[PDB]
Amino acid sequence: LNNPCNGVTCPSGYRCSIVDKQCIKKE
Known part of the structure; x- marks a missing residue:
């Protein structure tokens, strides 16, 4: 359900x- 921000x-x-911030950009 809350996987997407x-x-x-x-x-x-x-x-x-x-x-921490918005998105971690960890791919």
Whole structure:
């Protein structure tokens, strides 16, 4: 359910590092 970010859109299907920033860009 909450795999996709509940606010910002992550460019890739990784994880939403909303605690640190937006997206971790870890691919």
